[PDB]
Ligand binder design. Sequence first.
Ligand SMILES: Cc1cc2nc3c(=O)[nH]c(=O)nc-3n(C[C@H](O)[C@H](O)[C@H](O)COP(=O)(O)OP(=O)(O)OC[C@H]3O[C@@H](n4cnc5c(N)ncnc54)[C@H](O)[C@@H]3O)c2cc1C
Ligand SMILES: Cc1cc2nc3c(=O)[nH]c(=O)nc-3n(C[C@H](O)[C@H](O)[C@H](O)COP(=O)(O)OP(=O)(O)OC[C@H]3O[C@@H](n4cnc5c(N)ncnc54)[C@H](O)[C@@H]3O)c2cc1C
Lengths: 649, 649
Amino acid sequence: NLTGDIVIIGAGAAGSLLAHYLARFSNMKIILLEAGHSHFNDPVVTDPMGFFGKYNPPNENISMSQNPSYSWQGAQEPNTGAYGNRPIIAHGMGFGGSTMINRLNLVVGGRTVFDNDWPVGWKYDDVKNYFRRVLVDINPVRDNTKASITSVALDALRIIAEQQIASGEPVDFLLNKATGNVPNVEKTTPDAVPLNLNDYEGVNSVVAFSSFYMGVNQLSDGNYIRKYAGNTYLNRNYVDENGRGIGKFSGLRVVSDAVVDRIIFKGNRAVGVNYIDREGIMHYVKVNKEVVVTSGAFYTPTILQRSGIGDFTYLSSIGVKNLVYNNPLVGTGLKNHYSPVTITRVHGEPSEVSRFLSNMAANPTNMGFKGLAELGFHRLDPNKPANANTVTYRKYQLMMTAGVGIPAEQQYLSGLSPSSNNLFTLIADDIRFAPEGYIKIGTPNIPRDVPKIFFNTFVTYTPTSAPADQQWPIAQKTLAPLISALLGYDIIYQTLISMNQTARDSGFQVSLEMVYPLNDLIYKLHNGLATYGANWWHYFVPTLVGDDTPAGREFADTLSKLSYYPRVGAHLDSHQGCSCSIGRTVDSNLKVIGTQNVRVADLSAAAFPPGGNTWATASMIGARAVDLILGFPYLRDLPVNDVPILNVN
Amino acid sequence: NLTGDIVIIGAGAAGSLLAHYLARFSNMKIILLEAGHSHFNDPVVTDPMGFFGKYNPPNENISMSQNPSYSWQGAQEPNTGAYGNRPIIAHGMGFGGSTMINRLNLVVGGRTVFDNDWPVGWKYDDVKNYFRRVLVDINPVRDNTKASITSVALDALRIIAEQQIASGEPVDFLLNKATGNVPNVEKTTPDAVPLNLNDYEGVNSVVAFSSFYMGVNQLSDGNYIRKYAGNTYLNRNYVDENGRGIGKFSGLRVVSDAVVDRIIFKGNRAVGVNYIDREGIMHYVKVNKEVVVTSGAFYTPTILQRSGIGDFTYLSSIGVKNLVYNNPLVGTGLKNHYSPVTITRVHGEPSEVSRFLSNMAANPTNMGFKGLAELGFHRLDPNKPANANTVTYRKYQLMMTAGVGIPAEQQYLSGLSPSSNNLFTLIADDIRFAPEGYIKIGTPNIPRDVPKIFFNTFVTYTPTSAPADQQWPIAQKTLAPLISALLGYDIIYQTLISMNQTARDSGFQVSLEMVYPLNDLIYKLHNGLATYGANWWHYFVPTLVGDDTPAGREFADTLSKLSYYPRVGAHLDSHQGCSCSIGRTVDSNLKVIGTQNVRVADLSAAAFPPGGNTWATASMIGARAVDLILGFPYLRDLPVNDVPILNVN
Ligand SMILES: Cc1cc2nc3c(=O)[nH]c(=O)nc-3n(C[C@H](O)[C@H](O)[C@H](O)COP(=O)(O)OP(=O)(O)OC[C@H]3O[C@@H](n4cnc5c(N)ncnc54)[C@H](O)[C@@H]3O)c2cc1C
Ligand SMILES: Cc1cc2nc3c(=O)[nH]c(=O)nc-3n(C[C@H](O)[C@H](O)[C@H](O)COP(=O)(O)OP(=O)(O)OC[C@H]3O[C@@H](n4cnc5c(N)ncnc54)[C@H](O)[C@@H]3O)c2cc1C
């Protein structure tokens, strides 16, 4: 009954941008289908502080990610490395996709990752313009206030950096070789210029700064608003209430509350897509040129497999009727970030600790983030790439906030309840997280919130009856995440050690000591690390070492005991991706291998996790897909000053 | 073009029975729709020992409940009682429903529950016939191997019952009134008679027995077979591979791999239903006489709300197009069971402890359930109904099993590894669980695996500035499950203290005590119970009854500390139901209020959870529905010697 030319699945962080820009530069028809609906008039989502649970009913106070009305519930299979727990990860619904419910933080990832870990045609010098376009389209803002603790932390970081430069090691977490001998630490003078970590050139990869960039804008009244993909590209100024373009965009139509399940085929060419609406009737729309799937990391492999592309044996076993192309790589090698936490309690008298722990209240500009730096590889990490000693890589993202963020079980077990106001927290996020998994469809009837998702993070090692030299590489490969977590803990401990003297000489009379990981254990870890050198990680398996002295046995016991904290005392960030990576499921032209006219243009199609948060990356992939579909580098050569017009209502 | 007279939705524990006895006793064609498909030949479901995970790939070692191809994933919203945890409860898929993945334990429930907590027409003397029919049709078997510890436990229970009956207290857990002054404990003599707890007359309410009843059958080879509703009522004898009736059953037709979405109407009369098949197509089938929904506890209210019956405000807010009946009760009051776990350590010479703990290996006839008893209310329970001194109520279901059943986190924390061979578990089940919740849908597009499910278990009390005289009833109402759990812990403690003497007298020179609940803490709990009597539970709020007495401080501290284990060390049993009970949504005819020919025939329609495992109740309700639909008590007049024949292949 209907017809069309281009249909896009998922008005997310890339789908909305792609639809808007296809409508901008073309006369053909573009259709956008989205599972959810617009939420332009909700204080929970429109207000940035609504993410924190401000407009929630007293009997249903749950976050936006935990509402089935807002996001898909992606429960996973038990994690054998995490005591069998089943964390749930969510993808948002409606216009704007998952950007509706995020923390609104914006980063780029750096220049090294896009040059040494991506295929040709996707180096930094080809996507810097797209990064700039997206960043100036969102137009973030920085923090308003300036806490005293941030200056002390930056000074301590500068002291650590100068000590490391004086030592002269081949590679350290606080060394940047693109700037020379001078450390990349912002100065404490009131007139110090900000160290922008999303600079166009890419000089900063290991930089100590003081504020992130959030997609928040201030209105004329004086209250802040949340800016995301939906309220940037899909406002009433472009698409009306009916769901059709107005004036210049007359060729664009968007249907909301539409979920697709299957793609009609002709052997290699998609002939139509069917969707399910609120009343439950499936309609048929013709496809003339191409289709793009932008349903996210978890639901692009699912629609691909249910369409008839994937491992033939599995699809035939589960009863998939139509089979088109055979590929055992679909939905494989899923990557995600992971961030442990730590708590530090200050001592002294109430006046000084009150005047020192102030001005970190959450406001819509900092989102509770103070931020310290984005460090590199630790010197004693066994697993570094070849270019580690020559080119710096982003390994850790350091964050600090106020209060305590921990699940209540560990709060009760440790006894550090949030009643006390004399303690803060730090998060050493890991952007080089090693373990990967895969996604498989369960039943070929309807889209479902839970496919088969396997993700084993902190897996231990069992020795075999083999020579030790043949086992050590396998232990090195397997035991990477534990080493990374321990190195992050040691980094934070060194930061605290420097911060003690920095705060003592900065005019404050306080003493800072680690509390949550039982700082005596951290001290034992530091002593063992210093005494044992680079072979410290050999004591993960005491039997292979064979040492029986009390020092070695207690070091082994402490190392085993410290492995308990990252498994439960941490959080799993929702930065999943790389399920249809380039070179395995798709080529560098964003085309699936063996298909003719389908594309994937979301974070799933990425070939590697960026060195940080993953929003601008998805937006860039969408824009580059626009250029590849058109063939002309329109978005690369567009003037910077031309941006879409905001329209609140 | 496909049509039928009566359409049944959901081939669960009751739909299969209803369809079978509809085809047997009538000529009208019956159509059954099920989401899954037959698993007759799968060794994982057919072999009773396959429930424990014997036929799974080494790289996908997950149980049948956690596998999306076998069961739906019922992730619930976080509960403030369990530190915001989100346990997942699974409903089975395919022929037989959840009976495919259960432990097959069969318990009737008792007499008093069906007579005091159920309406007229659903009393015990009206459902005994159907309970007997179900038990005869399944034909369970008893245990094979006899354990020496079972006799010791039975003698200890007999001694405790003798003490309780000599004390002459008005009510206690080990007192029964259908027997008199003689304890209802099975004899320990070698020629003892089995003490059946599912007797026809229902005189058995508090019984100390030695073996449960499991739905397994021995074959000629010598191996057992899981006997559930699927192979019993829908085997190859009556329905072939193509799902058409054989002989008299020619009217019946069963379509596998069918997911129903909504029920169309004409103002007060349903006309047809639609389902999404394997090829993702919509099929419309005409309805002539009746439609019955038995989709389960979690998915009956969801389908009812998505159909057009339920709260108008919430459905209209979500976006449901059609509204029929304004019932604010659809999906209200969800009841489910609970089960804390304890661990006991046996001290002594290694040969003694090896000889004592023999013959507790799991078999396809006992499933590790040695079985102890079903107990009543504790004498110190603040909450007891009116008929406490008139009739006996069963509150607990005590069971014993070898090994340690606890999530691995607490195993690591306490150091009670399963590798040790001197520990066993005592489980104090709770069949009278107080708290309840509700079910709400999230998006009116497709039947989703995860709806909005709220269930808060262990909620604390908030003191208010007022005299405690008008505050105590509210605190008593709110603090019921904690009291029940602590009373069960005390029951297990005194059962163990009698176990010690009985084992010493029985020629076993072994000392034994509990470890996991921190035996000193439970000893302090028992001392405080004895000291304070009925005022023991007033110390959950130390502010309201503060005394500054060192004994008072110790009691308050040990009561606060003991509340952690029920929160962490327990498993939510999947006995959920009663969310669409009789008197709220349906009448005595099990007909939906405000409709004409809509009926519910599952466990969700139960007015109260039975005192035990809930497999038989669903089939009982299905048989009642058959009798109500037909109009003649055929199943009440069917001779016992008529049983359907099972077909292994
Ligand atoms: C709690 C949370 C916090 C985050 N914080 C940050 C942060 O601070 N910084 C950062 O950079 N990133 C952050 N992210 C990540 C960011 O929100 C997303 O990763 C980003 O939107 C990536 O783009 P996407 O296309 O994957 O988005 P998606 O939302 O995954 O886009 C796909 C969308 O398409 C729709 N869709 C899916 N399947 C179907 C279907 N079958 N039919 C129809 N429509 C469908 C849905 O609306 C879905 O959301 C956060 C994410 C979460 C969940
Ligand atoms: C792990 C586990 C252990 C258990 N152990 C015991 C035990 O020892 N003793 C005991 O008495 N009970 C036990 N139970 C409970 C017992 O298995 C069930 O509660 C009982 O069979 C209830 O049956 P039901 O048909 O009402 O529910 P279900 O079995 O959940 O019935 C639902 C049926 O309808 C189908 N269906 C659902 N939604 C749709 C839809 N939209 N369209 C079409 N079809 C649909 C499903 O595929 C399924 O066949 C256990 C349950 C679990 C999960």
